[PDB]
């Protein structure tokens, strides 16, 4: 008789501004809070928040504050979270429930649950990977990658932003889909922009590379007008020093049910870190303790069960003694 | 060049408040009745997302909470009221001119004295467990603080919802068979379910009810010794023979016990060589080890041979299995 309705499962977009209800019946929708749990398949359970029917009150999780949202329509008796701007963090099974109350709160729990809503993210599709060498000398030069996905730079211009420890964002240049190249005035003479359509790529050069060259670099899209920077990469880390003796590592090489995976071999100092689709990936991985070589370096293996084209397989690789990260997929 | 100076270059505020964050240009930075001011919001670690456009225009998915206005060489940001989520540094930019600029930055931060509160941990240890049907069984569950006997035991079958067995620690709700059991107070709970039937298999949670936020524990699976490796052989890559190496990996997904044996067959011929071992610890899902094996050698010796196999030895293998390829 007591029972809590929901809406239907949620293809969700990043950014996003979806509304999932939960229509109460069967007793006093006025009297008890509606609260709202949210599962993922590896977690368990957590708390977003609550809401009073009676009058509209609400208190969710420092969490989901300004995230998620939480209204009632008492000439509907229905509950809605109104989650805007998500992410494949909110990949996740939500619960409406409500906290039933005996004798004042002598006893409290959440007795009728609503069935579920399983909410989905997508994985972007537009793409922008930097690239480059963790590592370089004072008067030396640096040389970063742009490596664009789910867009072509025939029509799409591209931006190569810095972002100093401590300084704000610095604009470098632009490259526009017609070629037309654009500078910094205060940094032109030192900046090389170009691009390779082809490949699906972007290139900076800079020049007499001082220890305040030291930056995230990072390629940004242009959306359509006002063309302000609507997609940007995760960045790639460029420090300046004297010296990096020594100097290098991390080489990334590929590897019934199908198991698949990476190698992480010659590098040195230790250690090299490993995740996989940057993180949205811990079921059935295998990521081997290091062992020091023959060549003095160190070399370890990351393995990933997974069943029998479709899903996107990342291997997330750090190794920090070299200022380097890189990603890899996996193929036959 | 136009310069943007913003102001000030961090604040602290409280939760709930208004903020707002100037950003002044040089020249101005309107053309055709619109200026060509934007606003993008750096989260810590982050790259910087797109807030607002043409100074006043929020982009989708962005709060109604942040707004800006400004006209000329005058523009502001505004976050009324301020949420957890917003401590981040703000930029202001331009491309009123061919060369685009941003602003220093105002690093916004939540305050910070006086803090909070934490928030309570639940933890439900063993995270897996297996028994047989008509035995009594129990079932353990921790606190971080105290919540006296503010504690639920939750029950969930795999692609079902939670059914509440056990309230304030030692109740049973209703239509909860008279098999299931509670008991426990302040930071230690335990379930108990004598003479266990079928139905009793689900992932077994447990929930707090003393402080906000509501936390719940991790979870506990129930199932009802020997494992063979599932053998696999990897060869090197394109990518790793020109660097004029061969790495060969020999991969012992999920096994249990721990001893097993592996012998390396460099093309039908049984040789111990250059060959090292990694293994992963005791699982806490099914305790079963993971091993490889990876005889490294030269390109000088490898590229002759196009097969190789990998021996391995394993209790729960009647005799030992031997994995090749053919490049």
């Known amino acids: 008789a007591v029972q809590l309705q929901q809406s239907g499962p949620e293809l969700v977009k990043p950014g996003a501004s979806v509304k999932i209800s939960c229509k109460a019946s069967g007793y006093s929708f006025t009297s008890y809070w509606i609260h709202w749990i949210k599962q993922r398949p590896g977690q368990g359970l957590e708390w977003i928040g609550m809401i009073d029917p009676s009058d509209g009150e609400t208190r969710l999780n420092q969490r989901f504050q300004g995230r998620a949202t939480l209204t009632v329509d008492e000439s509907t008796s229905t509950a809605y979270m109104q989650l805007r701007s998500p992410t494949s963090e909110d990949s996740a099974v939500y619960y409406c429930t409500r906290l039933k109350e005996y004798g004042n709160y002598d006893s409290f729990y959440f007795d009728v649950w609503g069935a579920g809503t399983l909410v989905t993210v997508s994985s972007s599709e537009v793409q922008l990977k930097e690239s480059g060498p963790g590592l370089v000398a004072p008067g030396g030069s640096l040389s970063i990658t742009c490596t664009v996905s789910?867009?072509?730079?025939?029509?799409?211009?591209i931006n190569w932003v810095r972002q100093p420890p401590g300084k704000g964002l610095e604009w470098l240049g632009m490259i526009w889909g017609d070629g037309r190249i654009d500078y910094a005035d205060a940094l032109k003479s030192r900046l090389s922009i170009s691009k390779d359509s082809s490949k699906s790529q972007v290139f900076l050069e800079m020049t007499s590379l001082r220890t305040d060259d030291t930056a995230t670099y990072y390629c940004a899209r242009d959306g359509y007008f006002p063309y302000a920077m609507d997609f940007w990469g995760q960045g790639t880390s460029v420090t300046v020093s004297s010296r990096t003796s020594a100097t290098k590592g991390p080489s990334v090489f590929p590897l019934g049910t199908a198991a698949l995976g990476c190698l992480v071999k010659d590098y040195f100092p230790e250690p090299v870190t490993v995740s996989w689709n940057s993180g949205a990936l811990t079921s059935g991985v295998h990521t081997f303790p290091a062992v020091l070589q023959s060549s003095g370096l160190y070399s370890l293996s990351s393995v990933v069960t997974v069943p029998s084209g479709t899903q996107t397989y990342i291997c997330n690789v750090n190794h920090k003694p070299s200022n380097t990260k890189v990603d890899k997929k996996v193929e036959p | 060049d136009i310069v943007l100076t913003q102001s000030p270059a961090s604040l602290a505020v409280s939760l709930g408040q208004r903020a707002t964050i100037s950003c002044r240009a040089s020249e101005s930075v309107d053309s055709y009745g619109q200026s060509y001011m934007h606003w993008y919001q750096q989260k810590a670690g982050q790259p910087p997302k797109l807030l607002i456009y043409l100074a006043s225009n929020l982009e989708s998915g962005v709060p109604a909470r942040f707004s800006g206005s400004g006209s000329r060489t005058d523009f502001t940001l505004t976050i009324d009221p301020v949420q957890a989520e917003d401590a981040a540094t703000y930029y202001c930019?331009?491309?009123?001119?061919?060369?685009?600029?941003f602003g220093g930055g105002t690093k916004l931060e939540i305050k910070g004295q006086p803090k909070a509160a934490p928030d309570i941990q639940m933890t439900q240890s063993p995270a897996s467990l297996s028994v047989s049907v008509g035995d009594t069984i129990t079932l353990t569950c921790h606190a971080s603080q105290n919540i006296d006997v503010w504690l639920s035991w939750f029950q969930q079958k795999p692609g079902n919802i939670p059914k509440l067995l056990i309230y304030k620690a030692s109740n049973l709700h209703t239509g909860v068979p008279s098999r299931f059991s509670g008991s426990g107070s302040g930071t230690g709970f335990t379930l108990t379910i004598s003479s266990l039937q079928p139905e009793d298999i689900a992932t077994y949670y447990c929930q707090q009810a003393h402080s906000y936020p509501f936390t719940f524990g991790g979870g506990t699976k129930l199932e009802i010794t020997v494992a063979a490796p599932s053998v696999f052989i990897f060869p090197p890559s394109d990518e790793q023979l020109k660097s004029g190496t061969a790495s060969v990996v020999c991969l012992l997904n999920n096994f249990y016990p721990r001893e097993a044996k592996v012998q390396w067959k460099v093309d039908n011929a049984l040789q111990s060589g250059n060959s090292q071992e990694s293994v992963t610890e005791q699982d806490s899902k099914d305790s079963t080890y993971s091993l490889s094996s990876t005889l490294t050698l030269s390109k000088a010796d490898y590229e002759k041979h196009k097969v190789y196999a990998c021996e391995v030895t394993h209790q729960g293998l009647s005799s030992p299995v031997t994995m090749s390829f053919n490049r």
């Open positions: 930019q331009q491309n009123a001119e061919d060369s685009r600029t």
């Open positions: 789910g867009f072509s730079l025939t029509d799409s211009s």
